[PDB]
Symmetry: C2
Subunit: 229 residues, 2 copies
């Protein structure tokens, strides 16, 4: 067909889009991107006469109209979403709405920010005799068997998306599920963007280190012995 | 400098390498790739007069010699590793060995196969009111607090890398940690490669479905209610 193309933008760096992503983007007639969550530098890969829409200022129905009209005028349509949409992506709404209308689409994965964060930190989640797993979660209430404390019990590597002001709740949940105070932890803002910042520490001292970096906005926290390497 | 470039190849599809990855690869004088784990089609992006080495037939020290000699003749050196090396990547050996020699390097992340698997399945690990987390693990013995049964207790979404013949041990561990028999599950071989295959089912019937697909080799298993969407 001329499918609507859902494209993972990667974690911030211009060049961390997939080759496939880049081809579709650089050929798109209509692009719908996520506001300030997607790096604007990406948009420079688009055609001179491309029509850009910023979903951040749009309701669902407007995105869809924009999509449908792209299809009906035989225009290549790309919806750029941050990192990958299989982890915190809200792509279901748009898909169901397109089924409703009988519009073919496809999906092109991207590099998750937690992958970006690791490379950026030159670190490996899975490290022999230390951990063979990762738990990925994020921090208004949460069922017990899915809480940070509960996941902490495994003492494996963890990735936690948070709002940063909530640092003290999460540290205390980590200690509560039994991570020791010296457990290494890192907090990364805008992993792989030009402005990325990394605050390294342990469970006791990072609350302070985060406040004293003042750095606001959402972050990844990475927790575990795997930071010891 | 002229750093040794560690590059994530992505999950199999030629075009799912990052743009950055592609530039480095298409300019490399020396490439060291992982045997049959990396798709050979990628190698076609290399210069006519590029020197290819297949780590699969090499010990550590040979890789390093090959690296060092690239640097000393001012040759761009790319080590291509499958998916991303922060999850099951064994990049530590090569890095420590390069520190030893004082050789600058850098790291370029790629699309993990479990991301490839999701897009390929058009599915989302995190789905509102169903799960806000993912546990990523793999299946010769394993400590209790890090076993599949133990992780199963959270009833969240799981990704498990296995050898496929081991399907029955893992199903029984899943049920044991309390996933119900009707829990959807999928097994994917070579996610995003031309030959990828998807066996969809539930916990009771998938052991059979896998045997009767005969399909050998390593797979991803994906488990959870999140497959119900």
């Amino acid at each position: 067909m001329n499918k609507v193309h859902f494209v993972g933008a990667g974690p911030g760096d211009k060049e961390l889009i997939t080759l496939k992503g880049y081809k579709l983007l650089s050929n798109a007639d209509v692009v719908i991107y996520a506001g300030s969550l997607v790096n604007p530098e990406l948009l420079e890969y688009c055609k001179e006469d491309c029509q850009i829409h910023n979903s951040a200022h749009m309701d669902l129905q407007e995105i869809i109209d924009v999509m449908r009209e792209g299809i009906e005028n035989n225009k290549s349509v790309v919806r750029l979403q941050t990192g990958d949409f299989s982890i915190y992506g809200s792509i279901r709404e748009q898909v169901e709405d397109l089924n409703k209308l009988n519009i073919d689409y496809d999906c092109t994965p991207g590099v998750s920010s937690f992958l970006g964060a690791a490379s950026s930190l030159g670190v490996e989640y899975t490290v022999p005799e230390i951990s063979q797993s990762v738990i990925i979660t994020r921090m208004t209430p949460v069922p017990e068997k899915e809480s940070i404390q509960s996941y902490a019990k495994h003492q494996t590597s963890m990735v936690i998306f948070l709002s940063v002001q909530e640092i003290e709740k999460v540290v205390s949940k980590l200690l509560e599920g039994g991570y020791p105070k010296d457990t290494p932890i890192a907090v990364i803002y805008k992993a792989t963007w030009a402005d990325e910042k990394i605050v390294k520490g342990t469970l006791s001292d990072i609350a302070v280190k985060v406040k004293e970096n003042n750095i606001n906005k959402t972050a990844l926290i990475m927790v575990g012995r795997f930071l010891g390497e």
